[model samples]
Target: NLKIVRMDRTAGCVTGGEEIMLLCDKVQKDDIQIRFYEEVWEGFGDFSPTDVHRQFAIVFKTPKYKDVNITKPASVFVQLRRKSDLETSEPKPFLYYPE
Candidate 1:
């Protein structure tokens, strides 16, 4: 099982180019990926190798709602997944707001 301890920032501008640091536990550094979505959508956000920190953290870049056209603030779920074990963590809330 994986546990997300906390995130450096829980909110960001909807423009969605900012980076947020996510802290977690019991994750494999080289075998993990981060997924973000508001609801019903997956893989809306992406991650890179430079974002991983050992096995406990990730620096994630938020994705913009260009297709969805978000004009107001909204909350999304951020999750961690291990590719090797296919283990997914419970979703954590991340807020996005208009610039």
Candidate 2:
């Protein structure tokens, strides 16, 4: 399912660049990607193929948010994308807190 099973935490600073760990059912390291998006902005997680563990885990860092000047906390969706097809896992809620 490329389904994400768990997350260490769903909250991070507005500046992003935060490390996050996630668990999933099964996925190929080279076949999966992490995306963070909101209505007006989007970013990707920073991780190498080696960061994907045993087809069930990933350790990555969020790129800087579109606007570090955001005024308040906001919610965004984290998606697990598949490379072969455009299939993606369900969106997971993540919070970005103003720093």
RMSD to true structure for each model, in Å: 2.3, 1.1
lDDT of 1 by residue, 5-28 (tens): 898887777677778788889576
TM-score of model number 1: 0.78
Q: What is the lDDT of candidate 2?
A: 0.88
Cα lDDT of candidate 1 equals 0.74
Local error of candidate 1 at 41, Å? 1.7
1-99: candidate 2 lDDT, tens digit per residue: 768899998989988778899998899899888988998688889998899999899999987777788789888999899868968899999988888
lDDT agreement with native, every candidate: 0.74, 0.88
The estimated TM-scores of all candidates read 0.78, 0.93
Candidate number achieving the greatest TM-score relative to the actual structure: 2
